[PDB]
Write an enzyme that holds these catalytic residues in place. Structure first.
Site, PDB file in Angstrom:
ATOM      1  N   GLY A  46      -3.648 -47.849  17.096  1.00  0.00           N
ATOM      2  CA  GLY A  46      -4.987 -47.517  17.582  1.00  0.00           C
ATOM      3  C   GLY A  46      -5.222 -47.829  19.058  1.00  0.00           C
ATOM      4  O   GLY A  46      -6.365 -47.900  19.507  1.00  0.00           O
ATOM      5  N   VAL A  47      -4.154 -47.989  19.828  1.00  0.00           N
ATOM      6  CA  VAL A  47      -4.244 -48.607  21.146  1.00  0.00           C
ATOM      7  C   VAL A  47      -4.339 -47.507  22.206  1.00  0.00           C
ATOM      8  O   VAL A  47      -3.985 -46.357  21.944  1.00  0.00           O
ATOM      9  CB  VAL A  47      -3.040 -49.560  21.336  1.00  0.00           C
ATOM     10  CG1 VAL A  47      -3.038 -50.197  22.713  1.00  0.00           C
ATOM     11  CG2 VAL A  47      -3.050 -50.640  20.249  1.00  0.00           C
ATOM     12  N   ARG A  49      -3.512 -45.344  25.693  1.00  0.00           N
ATOM     13  CA  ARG A  49      -2.261 -44.840  26.264  1.00  0.00           C
ATOM     14  C   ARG A  49      -1.676 -45.839  27.279  1.00  0.00           C
ATOM     15  O   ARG A  49      -0.488 -46.121  27.261  1.00  0.00           O
ATOM     16  CB  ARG A  49      -2.494 -43.466  26.915  1.00  0.00           C
ATOM     17  CG  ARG A  49      -1.288 -42.535  26.885  1.00  0.00           C
ATOM     18  CD  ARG A  49      -1.614 -41.229  27.590  1.00  0.00           C
ATOM     19  NE  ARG A  49      -2.615 -40.461  26.854  1.00  0.00           N
ATOM     20  CZ  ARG A  49      -3.363 -39.479  27.359  1.00  0.00           C
ATOM     21  NH1 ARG A  49      -3.246 -39.110  28.637  1.00  0.00           N
ATOM     22  NH2 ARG A  49      -4.244 -38.852  26.573  1.00  0.00           N
ATOM     23  N   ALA A 115     -10.781 -40.084  16.292  1.00  0.00           N
ATOM     24  CA  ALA A 115     -10.313 -40.503  17.602  1.00  0.00           C
ATOM     25  C   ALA A 115      -9.445 -39.435  18.323  1.00  0.00           C
ATOM     26  O   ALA A 115      -9.296 -39.512  19.545  1.00  0.00           O
ATOM     27  CB  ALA A 115      -9.533 -41.816  17.466  1.00  0.00           C
ATOM     28  N   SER A 116      -8.874 -38.467  17.599  1.00  0.00           N
ATOM     29  CA  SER A 116      -8.053 -37.430  18.243  1.00  0.00           C
ATOM     30  C   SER A 116      -8.822 -36.609  19.297  1.00  0.00           C
ATOM     31  O   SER A 116      -9.770 -35.853  18.971  1.00  0.00           O
ATOM     32  CB  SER A 116      -7.440 -36.469  17.211  1.00  0.00           C
ATOM     33  OG  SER A 116      -6.771 -35.391  17.865  1.00  0.00           O
ATOM     34  N   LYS A 117      -8.390 -36.730  20.557  1.00  0.00           N
ATOM     35  CA  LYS A 117      -8.836 -35.808  21.626  1.00  0.00           C
ATOM     36  C   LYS A 117      -8.487 -34.350  21.331  1.00  0.00           C
ATOM     37  O   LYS A 117      -9.003 -33.460  21.984  1.00  0.00           O
ATOM     38  CB  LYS A 117      -8.224 -36.199  22.957  1.00  0.00           C
ATOM     39  CG  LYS A 117      -8.769 -37.500  23.535  1.00  0.00           C
ATOM     40  CD  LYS A 117      -7.798 -38.020  24.595  1.00  0.00           C
ATOM     41  CE  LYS A 117      -8.416 -39.027  25.559  1.00  0.00           C
ATOM     42  NZ  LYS A 117      -7.415 -39.517  26.559  1.00  0.00           N
ATOM     43  N   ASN A 118      -7.630 -34.117  20.333  1.00  0.00           N
ATOM     44  CA  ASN A 118      -7.218 -32.780  19.907  1.00  0.00           C
ATOM     45  C   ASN A 118      -7.754 -32.318  18.552  1.00  0.00           C
ATOM     46  O   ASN A 118      -7.183 -31.390  17.930  1.00  0.00           O
ATOM     47  CB  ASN A 118      -5.706 -32.770  19.853  1.00  0.00           C
ATOM     48  CG  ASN A 118      -5.094 -33.028  21.193  1.00  0.00           C
ATOM     49  OD1 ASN A 118      -5.076 -32.125  22.027  1.00  0.00           O
ATOM     50  ND2 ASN A 118      -4.546 -34.231  21.398  1.00  0.00           N
ATOM     51  N   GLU A 169     -11.616 -42.799   5.470  1.00  0.00           N
ATOM     52  CA  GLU A 169     -10.777 -43.441   6.496  1.00  0.00           C
ATOM     53  C   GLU A 169      -9.486 -44.021   5.958  1.00  0.00           C
ATOM     54  O   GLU A 169      -9.403 -44.328   4.788  1.00  0.00           O
ATOM     55  CB  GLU A 169     -11.567 -44.563   7.146  1.00  0.00           C
ATOM     56  CG  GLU A 169     -12.154 -44.153   8.478  1.00  0.00           C
ATOM     57  CD  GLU A 169     -11.111 -43.980   9.556  1.00  0.00           C
ATOM     58  OE1 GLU A 169      -9.892 -44.252   9.307  1.00  0.00           O
ATOM     59  OE2 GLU A 169     -11.545 -43.589  10.665  1.00  0.00           O
TER      60      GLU A 169
HETATM   61 MG    MG Z   1      -6.859 -42.330  10.763  1.00  0.00          MG
END
Ligand code: MG
Length: 218
Positions: A46-47, A49, A115-118, A169
């Protein structure tokens, strides 16, 4: 009855962790560094880049300039973007398309809280866009999981309070984000990881409309 479901993406709808790992592995090898195996990738999960790149650089005690750092960061990302181009509906986790069709035909709102920017890209690639009423932009939230912000936005984006909503989740910080938003979490994993104060299924096959109704109904 619950009015929305708020979906995490990675580890719930599908697997992006795999591609992030190869991106990082392909980078470390490319610049001499050993030890970036799946075990070590648990420290990158979860960190950020930048934070991840430090930890890979600390393995060999490699020194880099600030411009060399940002190019390495970019180069991992470029790799990752190349790599998620082969994502297909074949990668949709078990039971998940069926859960979406059922939620939809029961007029239950559907929102992505990832959290995905994509996210949007990934959802089109899996042919899932038509099911989703909103996508919470992770760029538009002040703070990431475990902060509730994203689940709050996903709920609000479909016009519900998170108290009207179930969150799904796979991770500890996600559960806590669902919990602090006011939404009801249903986990996918092990209580070892996520907690024993909440309802967890062992895999995504068990996330049925009827099961979510059962859990809500208390
Ligand atoms: Mg997940």
């Amino acid at each position: 009855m619950f009015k929305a479901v708020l979906f995490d993406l990675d580890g719930v709808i599908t697997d992006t962790a795999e591609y992030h790992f190869r991106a990082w592995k392909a980078l470390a090898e490319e610049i001499g560094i050993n030890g970036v195996d799946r075990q070590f990738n648990e420290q990158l999960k979860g960190v950020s880049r930048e934070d991840s790149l430090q930890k890979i650089l600390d393995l060999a005690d490699k020194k880099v300039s600030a411009e060399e750092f940002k190019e390495l960061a970019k180069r991992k990302n470029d790799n990752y973007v190349k790599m998620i181009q082969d994502v297909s509906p074949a990668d949709v986790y078990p039971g998940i398309l069926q859960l979406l069709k059922d939620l939809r035909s029961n007029k239950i709102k559907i929102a992505l809280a990832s959290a995905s920017k994509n996210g949007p890209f990934l959802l089109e690639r899996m042919n899932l866009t038509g099911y989703f009423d909103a996508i919470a932009d992770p760029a538009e939230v002040a703070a990431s999981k475990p902060a509730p912000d994203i689940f709050i936005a996903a709920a609000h984006a479909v016009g519900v309070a998170p108290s009207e909503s179930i969150g799904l989740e796979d991770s500890q910080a996600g559960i806590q984000a669902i919990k602090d938003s006011g939404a009801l979490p249903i986990g996918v994993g092990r209580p070892e990881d996520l907690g024993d104060d909440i309802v967890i299924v062992p895999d995504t096959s068990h996330y049925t409309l009827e099961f979510l109704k059962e859990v809500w109904l208390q």
